[model samples]
Target: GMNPPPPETSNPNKPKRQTNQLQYLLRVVLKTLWKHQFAWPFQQPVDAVKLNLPAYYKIIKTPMDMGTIKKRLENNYYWNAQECIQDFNTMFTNCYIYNKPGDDIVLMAEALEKLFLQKINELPTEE
Candidate 1:
């Protein structure tokens, strides 16, 4: 019988494919979150002056929002999916820090976090 072929050492295409897959996945996930009803509060940066929360900047050193993430993604700022996902986590945590735990807005942030986590799980993951 003919001998079986030997295993390949590496795939140059794999790295490129993996990068493109992650970018596409994040773009779609962000779009889905933007369309979510609970997403309105996080769509843009919090306007401290307009919202009359001067302490916002003081408490939140680096404010994160869907719009900012979208811009960063377009600029190719994120190095990996984890970094991109963390931005959403940062946005939600910022809300928690600024709002009362049991407030309606807090619940909205909670729901958004839940949804975001579930969506991210759809992408390929490592052990």
Candidate 2:
């Protein structure tokens, strides 16, 4: 009698289960921030959601003008090309350095980004 063949396997490249990229990113961001003392200068516990309030308020109270935001980000928030690249690099580095299994950093980061984007989109555009 011949030996039975081994069971076939699914595609190795494909994930066994589905994953949400936004959630993953958010979790990483949150854990990293938490690990870093919420990026505070002093050793104080800061709430990430609350910390974002100022920016959110700015987005809400300011005139619904993209140009206004663009100018503000450029002049105040360091939204230049270099700064944008640095922000991404920082996010990745933070996630890699402090991320732990079961941490939902990606979800946190994604939620934050999504809310920010949504707020921006809700702004009244000058046609």
Candidate 3:
């Protein structure tokens, strides 16, 4: 039998860790987005924005664990403080694209719709 790692001592100075998968995913996405030129921190021209370019890299960096996803779905998961930090990171990475003037929101909207549908389809059916 394998032994579990010993738990770390609780330190008041240390921040709480994130346990939810969705929260972690969102955090990574936002952080990755914030770092890209398409993110808000950059002053790139709106016309030069690349579609799905930043997302491609962001997705690559996101932590994708089936166990975490399953637990989150079953437990009515809520994002914790660490999750929020991750979200901020993602937002920071992608802020440029979101802040761009006259940027095409259609592609983003469409992609989100597709992603939602895909997630829905992946859910286990009760029947």
Candidate 4:
């Protein structure tokens, strides 16, 4: 009931203000991504030199939401972004086994695999 978008009338520098804030938040997000290291749990050594993009990016690339409400109503829903996001977000928020983005070990495929899996189980996955 009580909200305002802010006074965009007199603030000629509002553009700059928004720009600065965007840059600040962008840096924070980038830093979080930088420090985050993901482990699908090792099944086999992953390609040490082939990993790029945040784990989230890889996750969202796989689709997680349903294609239609009708599908869900009949228990025929497909994996869609919403569902996928929740599961992955949960893992990322809770799980802790990722290496930094630039660690030299990640470049080595053999060292990555055979050490972890499901890491809770024996199933194969990516980190």
Candidate 5:
């Protein structure tokens, strides 16, 4: 007669969790930027055709946009926070290069730059 019973096995197929704290911080900071008023201009890729600036793409070799950054973040494309920050700086610098001084779009980029830095300072020390 069988009298022994097998012990319950623990499930090993648990959903993966975000192991990096900075990744969470990056998400929050990006969300903050997305809600800012000045973020509209850099939210999506520039439409050169609609804007009638066909040369826009010709000048900006590496076009960086906030929307694309968000998608990259969601897909775990960034290896670290520095890479994410670099993309943001690239986005702002591209604006400075493409637009002239005091241009409306340039002004918006400047304002958003300040806001982005402010949020970045919120990152805490890890130890």
Candidate 6:
């Protein structure tokens, strides 16, 4: 029989479910910064999503051009490389909302990489 194990009678807390793709990706990026700044376990994925991402999203708000950062995940759970790019595109082609998308994407990518690598001082100017 495939009977499940009985629920714990004493402990109330349960293990966390696996995080979604956004959280997972953000976690990896922030982990490097955490390691660079501080050791130990480093901030968890949720912390990256909650605390860290606010500033990141704001700083890159103009550059990321996320088309709103709208979630277009498969089944609201998965993400592929191409789908990730279309997540930015406004229409079927690059003639409209994105002309020199290469440049736009570069600014965003460079900012994020700097954040992850703790190269904020390399930025053009201070806030």
| Segments in model 3 whose C-alpha atoms lie over 4 Å from true places | 1-14, 20-103, 116-127
Model 2 C-alpha lDDT per residue in residues 21-99, reported as the tens digit of each score: 2232234432344344223221221223555433332232211222222232333433133332244444433443444
TM-score (C-alpha) between model 3 and the true structure: 0.22
Q: Put down candidate 6 lDDT per residue, 1-127, tens digits, no spaces.
A: 1222321222225322223434433344333433543322122211225343344323332232222232222123223323333432322122222334566434444444456435322222212
Tens digits of per-residue lDDT for model 1 on 1-127? 1222322223444332235535754566887788888889887777777678878777887678887777666656655777677888889999999889889989988988888878787866542
* Per-residue lDDT of 85 in model 3: 36
Q: After superposition, how far is residue 96 of candidate 5 from its true place, in Å?
A: 0.4
TM-score of each: 0.77, 0.25, 0.22, 0.19, 0.78, 0.21
What TM value does model 6 have?
Answer: 0.21
How well does candidate 4 score on lDDT at residue 54? 36
Q: Which window of ten consecutive residues has the lowest lDDT sum in model 1?
A: 1-10
Ranking by TM-score: 5, 1, 2, 3, 6, 4
Q: How many steric clashes between backbone atoms does each model show?
A: 0, 17, 19, 17, 0, 0
- The count of backbone overlaps in candidate 4 is 17
On lDDT, the stronger of 1 and 6 is 1
Off by over 4 Å in 1: 1-18, 125-127
lDDT of 5 at 95: 91
Candidate 4's displacement at residue 8, Å, is 50
> Would you list the C-alpha lDDT of every candidate in the order shown?
0.72, 0.33, 0.35, 0.28, 0.72, 0.32
TM-score of 2: 0.25
For residues 1-127, write the lDDT of model 3, one tens digit per residue.
Answer: 2222222223345544445434434444333443444333122222222443444333333322223333332343433533433433343334333445434443443343344344433433222
